[PDB]
Amino acid sequence: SHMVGREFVRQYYTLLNQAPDMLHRFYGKNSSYVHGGLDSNGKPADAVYGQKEIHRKVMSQNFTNCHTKIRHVDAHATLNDGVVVQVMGLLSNNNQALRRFMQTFVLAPEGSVANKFYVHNDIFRYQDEVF
Amino acid sequence: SHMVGREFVRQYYTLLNQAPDMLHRFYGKNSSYVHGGLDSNGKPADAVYGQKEIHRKVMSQNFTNCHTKIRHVDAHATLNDGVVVQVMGLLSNNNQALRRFMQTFVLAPEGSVANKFYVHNDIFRYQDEVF
């Protein structure tokens, strides 16, 4: 267990604020991205795979000036020296009201220098969509 | 991605209600368990490792008649055909008021028959401890 993920969250949401279109560089060809959703009834949204499809859904959601302030991060370890991260903070896309969320990250070793890994899984959900 | 974790949550919280002392059978010698916490100031609690220490903290928290009703579960896939689970529901230990929580599971292949895996990571947090 190390703070590799803690310093990874340090740069993730910073990128999500500045250039959300560059967020796809974190993901490989074996990554799982989940956001939103709903969609569109009430049941949780589906998952997208592949860097081409992940970037496609990120651009669709439009993180225009999406500011973030995290309040809690849990980072430990898993298989292949991978660090799992449980994120819980507040999100505000396009200067909207803050939304409590629970996000989970899976970071697998990159392949060159092995840091700061690459997001193998990105499951994001809003609390207001569940209660 | 498969509903292996969905049918795993099916039996996890059921065990947490009935026999919380048997919950340690899910974990191996390389598992990470987090609950509570706080503790005890305000900062998030530490993580325990090893089946002997995990069971030690579970028994301490006393899940006496701890009933649970999950409202959302996200299960996909990771490395070594492992299924990650993001749980979000309501918890009530000892017939207390319901508490919104966000729990994350990492399920690594067992070694014999390979289902229903074994909990490699169990990070649990209450929302009321964060906001």
Author numbering:
A (entry chain A), B (entry chain A): 8 to 138
Provide text from the study.
Ras GTPase Activating Protein SH3 Domain Binding Protein (G3BP), a 52 kDa protein highly overexpressed in various cancer tumors, has in the last couple of years proved to be a significant cancer marker protein and a potential drug target. G3BP is involved in several cellular functions and is implicated for example in stress granule assembly, RNA metabolism and hereby cell motility, nuclear transportation and NFkappaB, Ras and Wnt signaling. In addition to the PxxP motifs, G3BP also contains glutamine- and glycine rich regions, an RNA recognition motif (RRM) and an N-terminal NTF2-like domain ranging from residue 11–134 in human G3BP1. The NTF2-like domain forms a homo-dimer with each molecule composed of three alpha helices (αI–III) lined up against a beta sheet made up by five beta strands (βI–V).
Initially, we were focusing our studies on the G3BP1 11–139 construct under the assumption that the N-terminal residues would be disordered and likely to interfere with crystal packing. Initially, we obtained hexagonal crystals of G3BP1 10–139 diffracting to around 3.3 Å. Two crystal structures of the G3BP1 NTF2-like domain, residues 11–139 and 1–139, were determined to resolutions of 3.3 and 1.6 Å, respectively. The 3.3 Å crystal structure of G3BP1 was solved in space group P6322 with one molecule in the asymmetric unit whereas two molecules describe the 1.6 Å structure in space group P212121. The low resolution structure was determined using combined molecular replacement and SIRAS phasing. The structure was refined to final Rwork and Rfree values of 30 and 36%, respectively, including 131 protein residues and one phosphate ion. Two loop regions, Gly43-Ala52 (loop III) and Pro116-Phe124 (loop VII), proved difficult to model but the electron density, including an un-biased density modified SIRAS map, suggested that these loops could tentatively be modeled, providing at least an approximate location. The phosphate ion occupies a special position in the crystal lattice, surrounded by six symmetry related copies of Arg107. The difference in resolution and space group between G3BP1 1–139 and 11–139 can be assigned to crystal packing effects largely caused by the N-terminal residues. Crystal packing is denser in the G3BP1 1–139 structure as compared to the 11–139 structure with estimated solvent contents of 42 and 56 percent, respectively.
